[PDB]
Amino acid sequence: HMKQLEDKVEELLSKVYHLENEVARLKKLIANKEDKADMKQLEDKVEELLSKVYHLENEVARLKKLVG
Amino acid sequence: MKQLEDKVEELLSKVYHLENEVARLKKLIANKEDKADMKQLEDKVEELLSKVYHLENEVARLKKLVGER
Amino acid sequence: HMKQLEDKVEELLSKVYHLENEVARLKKLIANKEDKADMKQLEDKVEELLSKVYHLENEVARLKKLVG
């Protein structure tokens, strides 16, 4: 019985060792993923571009009328 | 001895839970945006900023030439 | 025999505590990373901008010629 329990503890130690290795790998993977906190600057640039392009399109339509 | 047994029982439970949790986290990580992909998106946007700046300058000049406010 | 088993149970308790803490931390870190599914609207805007800007460039070239 004592042997059997010691064997179970050894098996669990081995499982925990494997999980530690897996967690180490996941830490590396997550470090190469984009943070939500870094999204906003890009989002703002895109929103500004959309506004600027809308204005340009409106101006170009007006110029086409006048030139033609 | 039974105390030791009960301790291993509770540790066993914790380990099974951690196995499940780590499996779930592995899946969540796979669904996240890569920094490398973000960088390429940022590069496109930087090019767009330059092109739009130029267009704005060209359109301002055209407006002047046709007498448009 | 008993002393050895206790030392391994103690070892396992400590390693599990360590693993639990780092998994809890990883969970929160992962939650702060951007999901690919939440990128699609931004990606579509950038694609739309590429097209709109290319079109504007062609229109503006044509206007510059016609205006003189």
Numbering used by the authors:
A (entry chain B), C (entry chain A): 0 to 67
B (entry chain C): 1 to 69
Extract from the study:
α-Helical coiled coils are ubiquitous protein domains, found in a wide range of structural and functional contexts. The structure of coiled coils is understood at a level unrivaled by any other fold. They consist of at least two α-helices, wound into superhelical bundles and held together by a mostly hydrophobic core. We find that they indeed break the α-helices to form short β-strands, which associate into a triangular supersecondary structure we name the β-layer.
We reasoned that the larger glutamate residue at the center of A9b might even be sufficiently unfavorable to move this construct quantitatively to the alternative structure, with the β-layer formed over the first three residues (IAN). A9b in fact crystallized in two alternative structures, but in both the β-layer formed over the central glutamate. We were surprised to see that the penalty introduced by the central glutamate was not sufficient to produce the alternative structure; the reasons for this are unclear to us at present.
